[PDB]
From Swiss-Prot:
Task performed by this protein: Serine/threonine protein kinase which activates checkpoint signaling upon genotoxic stresses such as ionizing radiation (IR), ultraviolet light (UV), or DNA replication stalling, thereby acting as a DNA damage sensor. Recognizes the substrate consensus sequence [ST]-Q. Recruited by the MRX-complex to sites of DNA lesions immediately after damage to initiate non-homologous end-joining (NHEJ). Subsequently displaced by the RPA complex in a reaction probably involving the SAE2 protein. Phosphorylates MRE11 and XRS2, 2 subunits of the MRX-complex.
Location in the cell: Nucleus; Chromosome, Telomere
Family: Belongs to the PI3/PI4-kinase family. ATM subfamily.
Coverage span on the entire protein: 2037 to 2281 of 2787
UniProt protein name: Serine/threonine-protein kinase TEL1
Length: 230
């Protein structure tokens, strides 16, 4: 008799087998699966409507736990199926509430977002400006000569006004990675050893940063823990 019961079971069965598959042999790019499961949680909203005792009582087990279901789907697609940084939007919004499990999905995705921040730090920002200046000086026979400059400059300015976009990307999607994975820490147990080292690393390299470390300035203030030993 389905008063929320079968609809929730069917989406659960879908996720239940899927998270085994996400840890299987070769899952190079399951972007599709991520999105299909996302839709089951986003659209089967009436998953709870009829309201009927056992139907409501499913909460006394787990019920949907959408953020976890959503972020598991988000995690298996990481790397080429990550869909670079645009995905941070889809991985966002379903922030639910503090709970017994969940802090760990933020760190898995958060860590990935940082891994991507490093697999970005390959852009030729050294010789970008270097070559621009090279051309500028060299902007002689091929430019200073005359009208050539007008066309060369047109191209140069358009080529020049580009790089800061990647800077902002690194300084923005990572803002979110960190804001949310830091804020979730609160109930630090079970998986903490690996978080301690992670945060050390964040501060270690990201020592001076008024926008990203700002999240860390707050997290330290919000976590006046008496542990901090190693």
């Amino acid at each position: 008799d389905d008063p929320s019961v079968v609809s929730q079971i069917e989406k659960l069965a879908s996720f239940t087998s899927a998270n085994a598959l996400w840890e299987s042999r070769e899952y190079k790019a399951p972007v599709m699966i991520m999105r299909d499961l996302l839709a089951q949680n986003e659209k089967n909203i009436s998953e709870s409507i009829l309201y009927d005792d056992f139907k409501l009582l499913i909460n006394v087990p787990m019920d949907q736990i959408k953020a976890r279901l959503v972020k598991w789907s988000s995690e298996s697609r990481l790397e080429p199926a990550a869909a670079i940084y645009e995905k941070i939007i889809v991985n966002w919004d379903i922030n639910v509430e503090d709970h017994e499990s969940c802090s760990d999905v933020f760190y898995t995705l958060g860590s990935f977002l940082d891994e991507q921040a490093q697999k970005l730090r390959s852009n030729g920002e050294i010789e970008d400006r270097e070559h621009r200046s090279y051309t500028g000086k060299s902007t002689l026979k091929a430019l200073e000569l005359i009208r050539h400059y007008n066309r060369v400059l047109l191209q140069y300015n358009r080529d020049s006004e580009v790089l800061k976009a990647l800077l902002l990307q690194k300084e923005k999607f990572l803002w979110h990675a960190l804001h949310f994975y830091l804020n979730t820490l609160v109930f630090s147990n079970r998986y903490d050893n690996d978080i301690i080292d992670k945060f050390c690393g964040l501060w270690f390299e990201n020592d001076d940063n008024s926008k990203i470390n700002q999240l860390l300035y707050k997290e330290i203030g919000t976590i006046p823990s008496w542990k901090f030993l190693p």
